[PDB]
Nucleic acid binder design. Structure first.
Ligand code: MG
Ligand code: MG
Ligand code: MG
Lengths: 152, 152
DNA sequence: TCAAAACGTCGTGA
DNA sequence: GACAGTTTGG
DNA sequence: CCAAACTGTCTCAC
DNA sequence: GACGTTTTGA
Protein backbone atom coordinates (compact mmCIF):
# COMPACT_ATOMS: atom_id res chain seq x y z
CA UNK A 1 0.00 0.00 0.00
CA UNK A 2 2.02 2.91 -1.40
CA UNK A 3 2.73 6.11 0.57
CA UNK A 4 2.61 9.17 -1.70
CA UNK A 5 4.73 12.25 -1.01
CA UNK A 6 2.69 15.27 0.05
CA UNK A 7 4.27 17.53 -2.58
CA UNK A 8 3.01 15.13 -5.26
CA UNK A 9 -0.52 15.01 -3.77
CA UNK A 10 -0.86 18.80 -3.41
CA UNK A 11 0.00 19.42 -7.06
CA UNK A 12 -2.00 16.40 -8.30
CA UNK A 13 -5.02 17.46 -6.24
CA UNK A 14 -5.03 20.86 -7.97
CA UNK A 15 -4.60 19.35 -11.44
CA UNK A 16 -7.30 16.74 -10.77
CA UNK A 17 -9.66 19.50 -9.59
CA UNK A 18 -9.11 21.14 -12.96
CA UNK A 19 -8.88 18.39 -15.66
CA UNK A 20 -9.52 15.20 -13.68
CA UNK A 21 -12.77 13.30 -13.17
CA UNK A 22 -14.07 11.14 -10.36
CA UNK A 23 -16.64 8.79 -11.81
CA UNK A 24 -19.22 6.41 -10.36
CA UNK A 25 -21.25 4.37 -12.82
CA UNK A 26 -24.03 1.76 -12.96
CA UNK A 27 -23.64 -0.31 -16.12
CA UNK A 28 -26.42 -2.62 -17.22
CA UNK A 29 -25.01 -6.09 -17.84
CA UNK A 30 -27.20 -9.24 -17.86
CA UNK A 31 -24.40 -11.47 -16.52
CA UNK A 32 -24.66 -9.65 -13.20
CA UNK A 33 -26.85 -10.74 -10.28
CA UNK A 34 -28.58 -7.37 -10.02
CA UNK A 35 -28.17 -7.02 -13.80
CA UNK A 36 -25.88 -3.97 -13.46
CA UNK A 37 -22.20 -3.40 -12.68
CA UNK A 38 -21.08 -0.75 -10.22
CA UNK A 39 -18.06 0.85 -11.87
CA UNK A 40 -15.67 3.35 -10.28
CA UNK A 41 -13.03 5.36 -12.15
CA UNK A 42 -10.42 8.00 -11.35
CA UNK A 43 -9.18 9.71 -14.51
CA UNK A 44 -7.02 12.61 -15.65
CA UNK A 45 -7.62 13.77 -19.19
CA UNK A 46 -4.99 15.52 -21.31
CA UNK A 47 -4.29 16.35 -24.97
CA UNK A 48 -2.24 13.57 -26.54
CA UNK A 49 0.67 15.88 -27.42
CA UNK A 50 1.02 16.13 -23.60
CA UNK A 51 0.70 12.39 -23.08
CA UNK A 52 4.11 12.20 -21.30
CA UNK A 53 2.51 13.95 -18.33
CA UNK A 54 -0.04 11.08 -18.15
CA UNK A 55 2.71 8.48 -18.61
CA UNK A 56 4.64 10.03 -15.72
CA UNK A 57 1.46 9.73 -13.59
CA UNK A 58 1.45 5.98 -14.18
CA UNK A 59 5.05 5.80 -12.96
CA UNK A 60 4.31 8.04 -9.95
CA UNK A 61 1.04 6.46 -8.81
CA UNK A 62 2.57 3.07 -9.61
CA UNK A 63 -0.68 1.60 -10.93
CA UNK A 64 -3.23 2.42 -13.65
CA UNK A 65 -2.72 3.07 -17.35
CA UNK A 66 -3.08 5.66 -20.08
CA UNK A 67 -5.54 5.25 -22.92
CA UNK A 68 -5.58 6.96 -26.27
CA UNK A 69 -8.56 8.41 -28.03
CA UNK A 70 -7.32 10.42 -30.98
CA UNK A 71 -6.21 13.93 -30.09
CA UNK A 72 -6.91 13.22 -26.42
CA UNK A 73 -5.63 10.74 -23.80
CA UNK A 74 -6.56 9.78 -20.23
CA UNK A 75 -4.85 8.37 -17.20
CA UNK A 76 -7.27 5.71 -15.86
CA UNK A 77 -7.31 4.16 -12.39
CA UNK A 78 -9.98 1.51 -11.81
CA UNK A 79 -8.76 -1.33 -9.58
CA UNK A 80 -10.53 -0.85 -6.25
CA UNK A 81 -7.71 -1.48 -3.76
CA UNK A 82 -5.18 0.93 -5.36
CA UNK A 83 -8.02 3.37 -6.05
CA UNK A 84 -9.00 3.42 -2.36
CA UNK A 85 -5.38 3.83 -1.17
CA UNK A 86 -4.84 6.67 -3.64
CA UNK A 87 -8.11 8.61 -3.16
CA UNK A 88 -7.80 8.34 0.61
CA UNK A 89 -4.48 10.20 0.35
CA UNK A 90 -5.58 12.73 -2.29
CA UNK A 91 -8.97 13.49 -0.72
CA UNK A 92 -7.80 15.93 1.97
CA UNK A 93 -6.09 18.15 -0.61
CA UNK A 94 -9.06 18.34 -3.03
CA UNK A 95 -11.37 21.37 -3.13
CA UNK A 96 -13.76 21.00 -6.07
CA UNK A 97 -13.87 17.17 -6.34
CA UNK A 98 -13.37 16.24 -2.65
CA UNK A 99 -17.04 15.37 -2.06
CA UNK A 100 -16.96 13.05 -5.06
CA UNK A 101 -13.81 11.39 -3.75
CA UNK A 102 -15.16 10.72 -0.26
CA UNK A 103 -18.31 9.15 -1.73
CA UNK A 104 -16.29 6.77 -3.91
CA UNK A 105 -14.38 5.62 -0.82
CA UNK A 106 -17.76 5.03 0.86
CA UNK A 107 -19.10 3.06 -2.13
CA UNK A 108 -15.88 1.03 -2.17
CA UNK A 109 -16.02 0.17 1.53
CA UNK A 110 -19.69 -0.89 1.25
CA UNK A 111 -19.28 -2.77 -2.04
CA UNK A 112 -19.19 -6.29 -0.60
CA UNK A 113 -22.27 -5.63 1.54
CA UNK A 114 -24.13 -4.25 -1.49
CA UNK A 115 -23.98 -7.56 -3.37
CA UNK A 116 -26.31 -9.14 -0.76
CA UNK A 117 -29.48 -7.09 -0.71
CA UNK A 118 -31.31 -5.51 -3.63
CA UNK A 119 -31.86 -2.91 -0.89
CA UNK A 120 -28.21 -2.26 -0.02
CA UNK A 121 -27.32 -2.37 -3.71
CA UNK A 122 -29.86 0.44 -4.16
CA UNK A 123 -28.63 2.44 -1.17
CA UNK A 124 -25.19 2.34 -2.81
CA UNK A 125 -26.66 3.23 -6.22
CA UNK A 126 -28.09 6.46 -4.76
CA UNK A 127 -24.53 7.36 -3.71
CA UNK A 128 -23.62 7.03 -7.38
CA UNK A 129 -26.55 9.37 -8.10
CA UNK A 130 -24.91 11.73 -5.61
CA UNK A 131 -21.44 11.76 -7.22
CA UNK A 132 -23.05 12.42 -10.60
CA UNK A 133 -24.99 15.31 -9.07
CA UNK A 134 -21.69 16.91 -8.02
CA UNK A 135 -19.99 16.33 -11.40
CA UNK A 136 -20.96 18.41 -14.42
CA UNK A 137 -23.01 15.55 -15.97
CA UNK A 138 -24.83 16.11 -19.29
CA UNK A 139 -24.77 12.58 -20.75
CA UNK A 140 -26.05 10.28 -17.98
CA UNK A 141 -28.52 7.42 -18.56
CA UNK A 142 -28.47 4.68 -15.92
CA UNK A 143 -29.40 5.77 -12.42
CA UNK A 144 -30.44 4.21 -9.10
CA UNK A 145 -34.01 4.66 -10.37
CA UNK A 146 -33.15 2.62 -13.47
CA UNK A 147 -31.92 -0.11 -11.12
CA UNK A 148 -35.02 0.29 -8.93
CA UNK A 149 -37.39 -0.53 -11.77
CA UNK A 150 -35.34 -3.49 -12.98
CA UNK A 151 -35.23 -4.98 -9.47
CA UNK A 152 -39.04 -5.04 -9.47
CA UNK B 1 5.46 42.55 -1.48
CA UNK B 2 3.69 39.32 -0.46
CA UNK B 3 5.33 35.93 0.22
CA UNK B 4 2.89 33.12 -0.69
CA UNK B 5 2.53 29.88 1.29
CA UNK B 6 4.19 26.90 -0.38
CA UNK B 7 1.21 24.55 0.05
CA UNK B 8 -1.05 27.17 -1.54
CA UNK B 9 1.37 27.47 -4.45
CA UNK B 10 1.77 23.74 -5.02
CA UNK B 11 -1.98 23.17 -5.26
CA UNK B 12 -2.48 26.26 -7.37
CA UNK B 13 0.29 25.33 -9.82
CA UNK B 14 -1.53 22.02 -10.38
CA UNK B 15 -4.83 23.79 -10.91
CA UNK B 16 -3.23 26.34 -13.21
CA UNK B 17 -1.58 23.62 -15.27
CA UNK B 18 -5.05 22.18 -15.67
CA UNK B 19 -7.50 25.10 -16.06
CA UNK B 20 -5.29 28.19 -16.00
CA UNK B 21 -3.79 30.41 -18.71
CA UNK B 22 -0.54 32.38 -18.92
CA UNK B 23 -1.16 34.84 -21.71
CA UNK B 24 0.87 37.42 -23.62
CA UNK B 25 -0.72 39.59 -26.30
CA UNK B 26 0.19 42.40 -28.67
CA UNK B 27 -2.87 44.63 -28.78
CA UNK B 28 -2.95 46.94 -31.76
CA UNK B 29 -3.82 50.34 -30.31
CA UNK B 30 -3.28 53.61 -32.20
CA UNK B 31 -2.62 55.69 -29.08
CA UNK B 32 0.69 53.85 -28.49
CA UNK B 33 4.04 55.05 -29.90
CA UNK B 34 4.70 51.67 -31.47
CA UNK B 35 0.97 51.44 -32.27
CA UNK B 36 0.56 48.37 -30.06
CA UNK B 37 0.21 47.59 -26.37
CA UNK B 38 2.08 44.77 -24.66
CA UNK B 39 -0.45 42.93 -22.50
CA UNK B 40 0.18 40.20 -19.88
CA UNK B 41 -2.59 38.13 -18.23
CA UNK B 42 -2.60 35.37 -15.65
CA UNK B 43 -6.08 33.77 -15.59
CA UNK B 44 -7.96 30.88 -14.09
CA UNK B 45 -11.24 29.91 -15.69
CA UNK B 46 -14.09 28.09 -13.97
CA UNK B 47 -17.84 27.62 -14.34
CA UNK B 48 -19.70 30.44 -12.62
CA UNK B 49 -21.49 28.01 -10.26
CA UNK B 50 -17.96 27.45 -8.87
CA UNK B 51 -17.18 31.19 -8.70
CA UNK B 52 -16.56 30.91 -4.93
CA UNK B 53 -13.31 29.13 -5.78
CA UNK B 54 -12.21 32.08 -7.94
CA UNK B 55 -13.29 34.59 -5.26
CA UNK B 56 -11.01 32.82 -2.77
CA UNK B 57 -8.12 33.37 -5.23
CA UNK B 58 -8.54 37.15 -5.01
CA UNK B 59 -8.36 36.91 -1.21
CA UNK B 60 -5.39 34.54 -1.27
CA UNK B 61 -3.31 36.24 -3.94
CA UNK B 62 -4.34 39.63 -2.57
CA UNK B 63 -4.81 41.28 -5.94
CA UNK B 64 -6.71 40.68 -9.18
CA UNK B 65 -10.45 40.28 -9.85
CA UNK B 66 -13.16 37.92 -11.13
CA UNK B 67 -14.98 38.59 -14.44
CA UNK B 68 -18.20 36.98 -15.62
CA UNK B 69 -18.86 35.85 -19.15
CA UNK B 70 -22.11 33.95 -19.64
CA UNK B 71 -22.03 30.57 -17.88
CA UNK B 72 -18.33 30.96 -17.03
CA UNK B 73 -16.03 33.19 -14.97
CA UNK B 74 -12.31 34.01 -14.83
CA UNK B 75 -9.85 35.04 -12.17
CA UNK B 76 -7.84 37.80 -13.90
CA UNK B 77 -4.43 39.22 -12.89
CA UNK B 78 -2.95 41.80 -15.30
CA UNK B 79 -1.17 44.10 -12.84
CA UNK B 80 2.45 43.81 -13.80
CA UNK B 81 4.20 44.26 -10.42
CA UNK B 82 1.87 41.89 -8.48
CA UNK B 83 1.96 39.57 -11.51
CA UNK B 84 5.75 39.40 -11.49
CA UNK B 85 5.84 38.68 -7.77
CA UNK B 86 3.15 36.00 -8.01
CA UNK B 87 4.54 34.14 -11.06
CA UNK B 88 8.07 34.27 -9.70
CA UNK B 89 6.75 32.25 -6.76
CA UNK B 90 4.47 29.93 -8.78
CA UNK B 91 6.80 29.15 -11.68
CA UNK B 92 9.05 26.53 -10.05
CA UNK B 93 5.97 24.40 -9.24
CA UNK B 94 4.49 24.53 -12.76
CA UNK B 95 4.87 21.37 -14.87
CA UNK B 96 3.01 22.33 -18.08
CA UNK B 97 3.09 26.15 -18.08
CA UNK B 98 6.50 26.82 -16.50
CA UNK B 99 8.13 28.09 -19.71
CA UNK B 100 5.23 30.44 -20.41
CA UNK B 101 5.51 31.86 -16.89
CA UNK B 102 9.25 32.50 -17.35
CA UNK B 103 8.71 34.22 -20.67
CA UNK B 104 6.14 36.52 -19.01
CA UNK B 105 8.60 37.27 -16.22
CA UNK B 106 11.23 38.12 -18.86
CA UNK B 107 8.81 40.34 -20.81
CA UNK B 108 7.80 42.29 -17.66
CA UNK B 109 11.41 42.96 -16.70
CA UNK B 110 12.25 44.12 -20.21
CA UNK B 111 9.13 46.25 -20.72
CA UNK B 112 10.67 49.63 -19.87
CA UNK B 113 13.52 48.79 -22.29
CA UNK B 114 10.94 47.71 -24.91
CA UNK B 115 9.30 51.15 -24.89
CA UNK B 116 12.50 52.97 -25.91
CA UNK B 117 13.76 50.90 -28.83
CA UNK B 118 11.66 49.71 -31.81
CA UNK B 119 14.28 46.98 -32.21
CA UNK B 120 13.99 45.99 -28.55
CA UNK B 121 10.21 46.33 -28.76
CA UNK B 122 10.16 43.89 -31.66
CA UNK B 123 12.49 41.60 -29.71
CA UNK B 124 10.02 41.42 -26.82
CA UNK B 125 7.20 40.78 -29.29
CA UNK B 126 9.03 37.61 -30.40
CA UNK B 127 8.95 36.42 -26.81
CA UNK B 128 5.18 36.76 -26.78
CA UNK B 129 5.19 34.79 -30.02
CA UNK B 130 7.00 32.04 -28.11
CA UNK B 131 4.34 32.04 -25.37
CA UNK B 132 1.53 31.60 -27.92
CA UNK B 133 3.56 28.77 -29.50
CA UNK B 134 3.55 26.97 -26.12
CA UNK B 135 -0.17 27.55 -25.35
CA UNK B 136 -2.81 25.68 -27.30
CA UNK B 137 -3.34 28.67 -29.54
CA UNK B 138 -5.96 28.98 -32.32
CA UNK B 139 -7.49 32.45 -32.82
CA UNK B 140 -4.18 34.36 -32.60
CA UNK B 141 -3.95 37.31 -34.98
CA UNK B 142 -1.38 39.97 -34.08
CA UNK B 143 2.23 38.72 -33.98
CA UNK B 144 5.79 40.12 -33.89
CA UNK B 145 5.87 40.21 -37.67
CA UNK B 146 2.51 41.99 -37.78
CA UNK B 147 4.20 44.65 -35.64
CA UNK B 148 7.28 44.70 -37.89
CA UNK B 149 5.11 45.64 -40.87
CA UNK B 150 3.39 48.56 -39.11
CA UNK B 151 6.82 49.77 -38.00
CA UNK B 152 7.83 50.09 -41.66
C1' DT C 1 0.94 57.87 -24.45
C1' DC C 2 0.61 54.59 -21.29
C1' DA C 3 -1.33 50.35 -17.71
C1' DA C 4 -5.38 48.23 -16.68
C1' DA C 5 -10.13 47.19 -17.09
C1' DA C 6 -13.92 46.03 -19.83
C1' DC C 7 -16.10 43.48 -23.05
C1' DG C 8 -16.45 39.62 -26.68
C1' DT C 9 -15.84 34.71 -28.96
C1' DC C 10 -13.38 30.78 -31.63
C1' DG C 11 -11.94 25.92 -31.54
C1' DT C 12 -11.19 22.73 -28.79
C1' DG C 13 -9.36 19.65 -24.66
C1' DA C 14 -11.37 18.29 -21.53
C1' DG D 1 -14.93 15.99 -18.22
C1' DA D 2 -18.25 12.45 -17.81
C1' DC D 3 -20.44 9.30 -19.36
C1' DA D 4 -22.00 5.05 -22.77
C1' DG D 5 -21.92 0.18 -24.40
C1' DT D 6 -19.11 -4.16 -24.83
C1' DT D 7 -15.66 -7.79 -24.05
C1' DT D 8 -12.60 -10.72 -21.20
C1' DG D 9 -11.31 -14.43 -18.34
C1' DG D 10 -11.04 -16.63 -13.79
C1' DC E 1 -21.04 -13.67 -11.57
C1' DC E 2 -17.62 -10.53 -11.14
C1' DA E 3 -13.48 -6.87 -11.52
C1' DA E 4 -11.25 -4.75 -14.88
C1' DA E 5 -10.29 -3.74 -19.32
C1' DC E 6 -11.54 -2.15 -23.86
C1' DT E 7 -13.75 1.07 -26.95
C1' DG E 8 -16.66 5.13 -28.32
C1' DT E 9 -18.92 9.90 -27.92
C1' DC E 10 -21.92 14.15 -26.20
C1' DT E 11 -21.78 18.79 -24.57
C1' DC E 12 -19.69 21.67 -23.02
C1' DA E 13 -16.04 24.45 -19.59
C1' DC E 14 -12.37 25.72 -20.47
C1' DG F 1 -8.13 28.05 -22.62
C1' DA F 2 -6.50 31.67 -25.34
C1' DC F 3 -7.07 34.80 -27.79
C1' DG F 4 -9.75 39.26 -30.00
C1' DT F 5 -11.30 44.72 -29.79
C1' DT F 6 -12.43 48.78 -27.31
C1' DT F 7 -12.73 51.98 -23.36
C1' DT F 8 -11.12 54.01 -19.03
C1' DG F 9 -8.48 56.97 -16.33
C1' DA F 10 -3.57 59.33 -14.42
MG1 MG G 1 -11.96 22.02 -15.13
MG1 MG H 1 -9.99 21.95 -18.42
MG1 MG I 1 -6.22 21.68 -19.34
Amino acid sequence: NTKYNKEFLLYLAGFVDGDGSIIAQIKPNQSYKFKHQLSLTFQVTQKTQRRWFLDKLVDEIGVGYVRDRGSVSDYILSEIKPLHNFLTQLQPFLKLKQKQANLVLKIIEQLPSAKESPDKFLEVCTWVDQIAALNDSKTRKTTSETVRAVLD
